[PDB]
Design a protein around this ligand. Structure first.
Ligand SMILES: O=c1[nH]cnc2c([C@@H]3N[C@H](CO)[C@@H](O)[C@H]3O)c[nH]c12
Ligand SMILES: O=c1[nH]cnc2c([C@@H]3N[C@H](CO)[C@@H](O)[C@H]3O)c[nH]c12
Ligand SMILES: O=c1[nH]cnc2c([C@@H]3N[C@H](CO)[C@@H](O)[C@H]3O)c[nH]c12
Lengths: 278, 278, 278
């Protein structure tokens, strides 16, 4: 295997962007889908379709602008391993962002609650991840390493910025809420099918608190090239963890688990901006 | 990655079959190898070699006929990830079956007993699975989804039909047997080499009861497109679970673990037919 | 998928080698990198670069010679899944070795200690492995099997020769050392990034004692074709197993964890030679 992109392809995507928008983003935000009407909060919103973007994998848009005093770039729609993309395509935008000048990555996603304490609607702050595809070989850094981005063997034990995590628990308290900010381990599985009961039990045993099909690869790539990362999971569903229970996970409840729980998340992210140091 | 087949290739395999046999199967059966002399029980047996079959991966035969009052199609020999097939080839026949008109899938396989209660010879009824290749990306649905088959994000928490499971425990009692029908979680690993002792201990800890190298992908594809699924593992070997024990798993004992334990299985499947609703 | 090499490519690499060196090796040694200045201990050292070697994947050298009374072949630098090589390239030299006449494989590697009893510097003798890439499909034997090498379904429950393990604990006692020879399960993960804390906790729970990114595939291929295998991990780092700890795994401490701990290892291997039966 080999990454299709050369250092230069990245570099030429970045330049193209640098020249087609006067915005100079500092914070990249990678939202779910449902969990990002977050586009209206921006101001001076400039949109590019992925389709116009030299090299951009493949209705997918890059929106540049200003969230609450920070210059942002928001990916609206992301790529997934389950769509068939190799990981070096899934995480191509991350490297592009670094070269645009960005120094922080915020990632959000929807995920099934594995911890029996979580409730549909909860926001879980990501403290750590379990990269199960990565154990087998599906790590987005597989291949020759390019030292212009970062090291051969980057560390992930501190992927999720301790400072931003503290500031996120501050901010949340900064509005004394009906539920608290949750915290835990996000496990990535490839999907696109949902877990069996036995699989759920496997993931609870591994120590995971939430489960989804994304995020981890962008986080690894982000950290490889020196960005500060933090993120959240909107728990959209409690994963079925025993056999009598006749109820099921669907793409419908994940999507339709926008509502006040998703608006909550938008506003939370938008306030966070103020805790990101210039 | 991308599935090599288009909706049309399936469709043209099905039509070719619809026109070359007057049989109209309702139940697809996917047997092991050793565990399916089950071909003689059929009547009005019409055979096609895979080799004559427009598109069929690659001595492999589709046998059409009548098991105990049901119109069947029996795959004789299957494909495996360990032979090098991508999963979209392994599970191609499943989609073909759906379009032939089939509404039920019975899958059987040979597997090592992980549960220390099992004994060589036991039939384990499949209650659930742990799809370890699927955690990393080897899910046969990886790629663009085709809604003519089914949803983007199908559920697997109920893959193994509760009704058929109940009817299977009925039927077994319907002949008050020397051992009981076993029940549990089948875990798929890719192979083709057998597990170490430490690996066995891993799989026991995950909650698995039996282990093999097949089945799970056909089950996921079956469920993706609305079939009713049930299956069995003939436990052909107790997997070596500690270090003094000098005895070893071989392809010889799996094969030669036909005998009265495999005939038992044939007859069991053949009676089951009567519990499959028209 | 398919292995790029045919039985003949192996065969022609071997012959080329058989004819370009009068050495006839019996023991293949596959060292780390840092953990093999072991080249000077050899005598009658003949070097080939990988680059001159018909078919050899891709500064990489095969060194032929004599360790302590045994005819050796030492791979200096190896291939890794994380560099992008498929496993059938990573393990190509192993098959070549078998055809050179070799009957034993010694493998060594650097690995993070998962067992809280290990200490940086410790040598762990490999008693077993957990091949996590192999669970998902990344097994170097994936594809049609070639019976000239070995069986379709080889066993790995005895991969790590019990005799050589006993002789290794003898030999170590044969110099009554400040720490003892450690022993345990090596788990392979693909890398190239290092584990999170949560991942470490996963691997401790699976029963693993050390973790690295190599070895397992060569061992599986070695055993597939009948070689005797034994190996070691030099524990170069204690893997970070809880969150307050601010210290991190780096490629620098792994490399610079040569020193007296690596010389110890060289000398240990060099004495071992005397326990390998002719
Ligand atoms: O219970 C779950 N298991 C795995 N993934 C998801 C998700 C996320 N939502 C999407 C599927 O609805 C998918 O893109 C995935 O990342 C929500 N709930 C679950
Ligand atoms: O102990 C085992 N581990 C993994 N697979 C199998 C099998 C099944 N039998 C075949 C190998 O003998 C293979 O196709 C696999 O699906 C029997 N026993 C075991
Ligand atoms: O803590 C660890 N986790 C995973 N691999 C390694 C290694 C081994 N060392 C190399 C990276 O420094 C790499 O080739 C890997 O096989 C040392 N320590 C660790």
């Amino acid at each position: 295997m080999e990454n299709g992109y050369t250092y230069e392809d990245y570099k030429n995507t970045a330049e193209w962007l640098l020249s087609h928008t006067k915005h100079r983003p500092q914070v990249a935000i990678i939202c779910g889908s449902g969990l990002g009407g977050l586009t209206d909060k921006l101001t001076q919103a400039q949109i590019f379709d992925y389709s116009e973007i030299p090299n951009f994998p493949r209705a997918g848009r890059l929106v540049f602008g200003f969230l609450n005093g920070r210059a942002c770039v928001m990916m609206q729609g992301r790529f997934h391993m389950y769509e068939g993309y190799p990981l070096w395509k899934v995480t191509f935008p991350v490297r592009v962002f670094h070269l645009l000048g960005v120094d922080t990555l915020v990632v959000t996603n929807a995920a099934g609650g594995l911890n029996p304490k979580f409730e549909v609607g909860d926001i879980m702050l990501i403290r750590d991840h379990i990269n199960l595809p990565g154990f087998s070989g599906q790590n987005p850094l597989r291949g020759p390493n390019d030292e212009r981005f970062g090291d051969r063997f980057p560390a992930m034990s501190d992927a999720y910025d301790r400072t931003m995590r503290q500031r996120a628990l501050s901010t949340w308290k900064q509005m004394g809420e009906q539920r608290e900010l949750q915290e835990g381990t996000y496990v990535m599985v490839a999907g696109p099918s949902f877990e069996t009961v036995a699989e759920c039990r496997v993931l609870q045993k591994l120590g995971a608190d939430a489960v989804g099909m994304s995020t981890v690869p962008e986080v690894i790539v982000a950290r490889h090239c020196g960005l500060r990362v933090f993120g959240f999971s909107l728990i959209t569903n409690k994963v079925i963890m025993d056999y009598e229970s006749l109820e099921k996970a669907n793409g419908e409840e994940v999507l339709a688990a926008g509502k006040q729980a998703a608006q909550k998340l938008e506003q939370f992210v938008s306030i966070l901006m103020a805790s990101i140091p210039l």
